[PDB]
Ligand SMILES: CC(C)c1ccc(O)c(=O)c(O)c1
Ligand SMILES: [Mn+2]
């Protein structure tokens with residue numbers, strides 16, 4: 030069994046448990062009574078000062094409640110693993126179909142370093158503080174923890190070897206409680222291989238991981254930056270155009286607005302139609318060109334956090350951008366929709382956060398830190414109510430209405 | 439003896455508290471050896487040989503002016519040096535969270551902390567010395583054998599041991615509800631009066647078989663059940679008017695007992711503001727610290743004291759019915775709400791004050807109220823109440839669909855109880871045809887703070903105005919204000935201030951800033967207002983013109 034520790038000179042996680050509905054508290058009590066019986070977790074005393082939040086979620090589709098521990102704080106306090114840690118397959122994104130499987134269940138089979146158990150403490154809250162908190166700590170590889178897939182690496186390899194050798198061409202990436210299986214087979218056989226990979230795990234050693242979260246990376250589209258094309262512009266159109274090209278000149282140094290502004294010479298009514306000059310037309314053409322080739326120099330850097338900004342665009346539409354350095358976007362997309370008049374802004378945003386974090390895992394092998402267009406107190410209240418992933422990314426809250434909303438269409 | 443001692447560790451790298459004993463009077467010592475001799479007999483403490491190396495200061499003082507001397511130990515260095523524990527949810531159970539049970543009984547377990555053993559290996563850090571009178575003999579050295587009072591670990595360790603003791607009586611009676619809060623043990627049930635008393639007899643013996651004297655009663659009054667400050671009646675609970683101390687010089691150890699009270703009362707009583715009295719008091723420790731409050735604290739204690747002067751009544755929770763929450767708009771950043779199941783039978787009534795910030799508007803405040811109520815309800819009842827709110831469904835729709843941020847309210851219905859919350863002004867999405875276009879700009883000189891604010895328009899109209907003691911950010915809002923002033927009912931307004939755009943694109947309807955307000959009002963008077971934005975110094979006409987006019 031493996032020796033783990035916290036980064037040098039820092040103490041463990043002491044986060045507070047947020048309130049849970051009655052429904053959720055009940056499910057957690059069931060799940061934990063079982064787990065205590067199976068020897069996975071053990072009640073602890075008050076001499077253990079640490080704590081990690083814990084709530085419950087239903088997955089994409091199940092009858093069933095899944096205990097989700099928010100280890101975010103323990104994760105960034107857990108010594109990175111190198112003495113091990115996983116490699117990301119750049120080919121995964123290029124595949125026609127990628128299915129995600131919950132193998133997390135398998136982590137419970139490996140014992141956790143006796144001395145590291147205390148740092149995994151958590152508490153099930155009681156309604157109206159009738160009873161004081163029921164407290165546990167893990168004795169095994171806890172799901173949602175990063176030190177988990179790291180220690181179950183050798184074990185996970187040995188289990189997939191036969192499938193790898195025989196099935197050599199699929200790509201299999203392991204992230205947290207997740208296993209990303211990608212292939213260029215047709216959905217029929219692709220899903221046969223999966224079920225085949227499924228059986229492999231059931232045979233090689235909560236409980237459901239029956240389900241496939243199937244994605245199609247080969248069909249994910251980036252949104253470029255475009256400029257309107259009109260037969261008659263107004264002072265206002267031109268003013269907007271110039272404001273945006275001036276913004277796009279921070280990313281593409283070759284942008285020129287000279288000949289366009291020159292069209293706004295004097296002081297006109299915003300609704301006045303201004304004819305386009307040859308000079309202007311050309312400048313518009315040339316800029317239009319430049320805006321279609323990629324940014325000059327943006328390769329991904331693994332030792333740096335990823336950053337994702339989201340812009341509520343209205344009518345259920347959302348745009349986002351991932352980057353490490355400002356104006357050096359690795360990706361930009363537009364999350365059009367759930368299909369309609371989606372009446373829960375907060376739900377849409379929570380769905381967008383997960384999709385984006387998914388795409389991010391597939392492409393760089395890690396989750397981005399989010400800058401969310403919401404009031405912290407509104408997000409903290411309702412987000413766990415729409416969460417369906419087994420992982421949780423880092424986020425902050427944007428209080429100041431950005432101007433880039435006006436430009437990322 | 440029957441209880442399993444909890445393992446306790448001093449903080450890492452820290453050693454035991456070596457302290458010096460303060461000499462005492464023959465009258466304070468004699469007593470002590472008395473209070474001690476008895477304590478040593480119950481086995482609460484032991485005499486240590488000459489040889490332990492740690493020490494804690496021992497003091498001895500009065501309990502009533504009906505004079506006697508009780509014992510006081512200064513566990514200050516030791517509380518610094520002792521491992522952190524988990525205060526768990528230092529949450530406070532709300533009477534309205536209790537459900538109607540028939541029979542109830544409150545057992546006041548307090549004397550029990552002395553009755554819990556202390557980790558054998560840790561007892562040596564609790565050594566204290568009783569000074570000798572003429573220092574002709576060696577002092578007398580005791581160490582603690584039970585959770586010592588005044589220490590870090592007695593609170594949590596005991597409240598924990600208790601749980602373990604009760605957790606077996608609790609499992610055996612799936613129907614009986616038991617809640618523990620400090621001294622207090624609440625036992626509820628639907629049983630007849632006489633089967634209840636019976637079980638209570640088993641619980642009492644079960645606690646005794648684990649080695650802790652239950653007190654039963656020495657002055658026996660009625661069914662008005664007293665459980666951690668609440669008066670529990672068959673079908674209603676009551677909190678008697680809280681009497682706050684009235685005094686000349688406030689102390690740091692009476693001001694601390696105050697915030698605790700205020701907090702406790704904070705969730706029973708509405709509008710209990712305690713944020714000023716906490717900023718005078720924290721992390722500063724006293725041999726010699728004694729405090730005047732600040733005249734914003736004698737006036738608050740004034741307001742709190744006025745609110746705690748009226749009794750609080752409420753009904754219990756009936757899980758078979760919906761939970762309802764109704765809010766009304768009260769003013770000056772104030773809102774009132776009542777949570778109930780049956781109309782006029784309130785479970786909890788409260789008040790929400792606006793959260794600090796320069797600009798704001800009624801809609802953002804209501805939303806903040808809902809999420810506060812929502813979270814409070816989930817803590818007490820485990821569910822989210824339905825909301826009766828003073829805002830049209832059409833208003834809210836217009837708001838969240840257009841607001842640049844993500845926002846949501848739970849299931850809710852409109853209730854017409856003026857003053858209704860609404861949107862005072864609405865910026866347009868497109869330019870307004872036939873309206874005058876006001877390109878505006880401003881500038882200021884940081885050295886002299888002298889600046890100008892102007893605007894030019896497609897109709898030739900123009901105006902610049904000199905200003906003193908102003909800023910760049912100030913002058914662009916000032917320029918907008920001027921534009922709003924001199925324009926008709928409908929108006930297009932081009933600016934180059936990202937700052938001004940930020941403030942207006944937030945749609946505020948009161949700011950604690952006179953200027954913004956002036957603009958706000960001006961907006962409320964307009965029928966149509968289209969507010970554009972352009973980059974500065976890029977040659978767009980009429981941004982340049984006006985820039986030239988205000989720059990120099
Ligand atoms: C070019 C810089 C100094 C600048 C920034 C912001 C403004 O609002 C201005 O009006 C301006 O004239 C200049
Ligand atoms: Mn300006």
Ligand SMILES: [Mn+2]
Pocket residue numbers: 879880881974985989
């Ligand atoms: Mn200017």
